[PDB]
Amino acid sequence: EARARLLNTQGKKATRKIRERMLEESKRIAELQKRRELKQAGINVAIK
RNA sequence: GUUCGCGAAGUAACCCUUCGUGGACAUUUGGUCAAUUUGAAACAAUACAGAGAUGAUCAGCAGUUCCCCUGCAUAAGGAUGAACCGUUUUACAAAGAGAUUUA
Ligand SMILES: [Mg+2]
Ligand SMILES: [Mg+2]
Ligand SMILES: [Mg+2]
């Protein structure tokens, strides 16, 4: 319990940020391979 | 349209009427702006969650910003208002030791 406790220094807010940011990156990757597979159909859809 | 005056005609007896003409009086509004889709309100609803300092549950003041919102406000609130929490290499040298090349 303690040996696990010491190792995280931040507090709820920072961790919350780590998540939010990664979720943004999943959004990016997804939207990309959206556009990639649409290029494999040749139809070119512009990014927002 | 008024008035002054002239001329003409008629009525007349110096006038009443009609015609013509001269003169004066009176003298430049408004527009940054066309009448609903295509020159710009903002909320709400759906889904996703669902409140900083900590191991945890709360009071809070601040600080910076090419973010502001409510408020008459130089008051005070808006999660202590929100954003901050991340990515990170060179004024660069001196001494010593081994390998390589050359005068
Ligand atoms: Mg305040
Ligand atoms: Mg609080
Ligand atoms: Mg504040």
Task: Outline the fold blueprint.
Elements lengths: L1 H4 L6 H29 L8
The structure holds magnesium ion (MG) (3 copies).
It binds one RNA strand of 103 nucleotides through α2.
Describe the structure.
- The protein has helices at residues 2-5, 12-40.
- The chain is mainly α and 48 residues long.
- Bound molecules: magnesium ion (3 copies).
- It binds one RNA strand of 103 nucleotides through residues 1-2, 5, 10-14, 17-18, 21.
- This is Pre-mRNA-splicing factor CEF1.
Q: Please describe the biggest sheet, giving its number of strands, its sense, and whether it closes into a barrel.
A: none
How would you classify the helix and strand content by structural class? mainly alpha
Oligomeric state as shown: part of a larger assembly
The run of helices and strands is HH
- Describe the global form: rod-shaped
Radius of gyration in whole Å, from Cα?
18 Å
**Gap from first CA to last CA:** 46 Å
Distinct ligands: magnesium ion
Fraction of helical residues: 55-70%
Tally of contiguous helical segments: 2
Number of strands: 0
Percentage of residues in DSSP E strands: under 5%
